[PDB]
């Protein structure tokens, strides 16, 4: 049908923005874990070398 | 009627086939 004239375009751009979000959020959660695992490490190291 | 991301225009019938 004619309304299918947008079926292959609106969904195509939605998939484009989906892969966008995949790039900008699968990397963002890496910013979440990277900024967190590297932040809980310093105090643990401090206590590790402060028992001695 | 469908089927930046697309091109629109209008031409004379003399060259529609070519």
From Swiss-Prot, chain B:
* Cellular location(s): Vacuole membrane
Q: Which residues form the signal peptide?
A: none
This protein's superkingdom?
Eukaryota
- Processing after translation: Glycosylated.
Q: What else is known?
A: Present with 55714 molecules/cell in log phase SD medium.
Family named by the database record = Belongs to the V-ATPase 116 kDa subunit family.
Task: Cite the record's note on assembly.
Answer: V-ATPase is a heteromultimeric enzyme composed of a peripheral catalytic V1 complex (components A to H) attached to an integral membrane V0 proton pore complex (components: a, c, c', c'', d, e, f and VOA1).
Briefly state the protein's biological role.
Subunit of the V0 complex of vacuolar(H+)-ATPase (V-ATPase), a multisubunit enzyme composed of a peripheral complex (V1) that hydrolyzes ATP and a membrane integral complex (V0) that translocates protons. V-ATPase is responsible for acidifying and maintaining the pH of intracellular compartments. Is present only in vacuolar V-ATPase complexes; enzymes containing this subunit have a 4-fold higher ratio of proton transport to ATP hydrolysis than complexes containing the Golgi/endosomal isoform and undergo reversible dissociation of V1 and V0 in response to glucose depletion.
**What protein name is recorded for this chain?**
V-type proton ATPase subunit a, vacuolar isoform
Which organism is this protein's natural source?
Saccharomyces cerevisiae (strain ATCC 204508 / S288c)
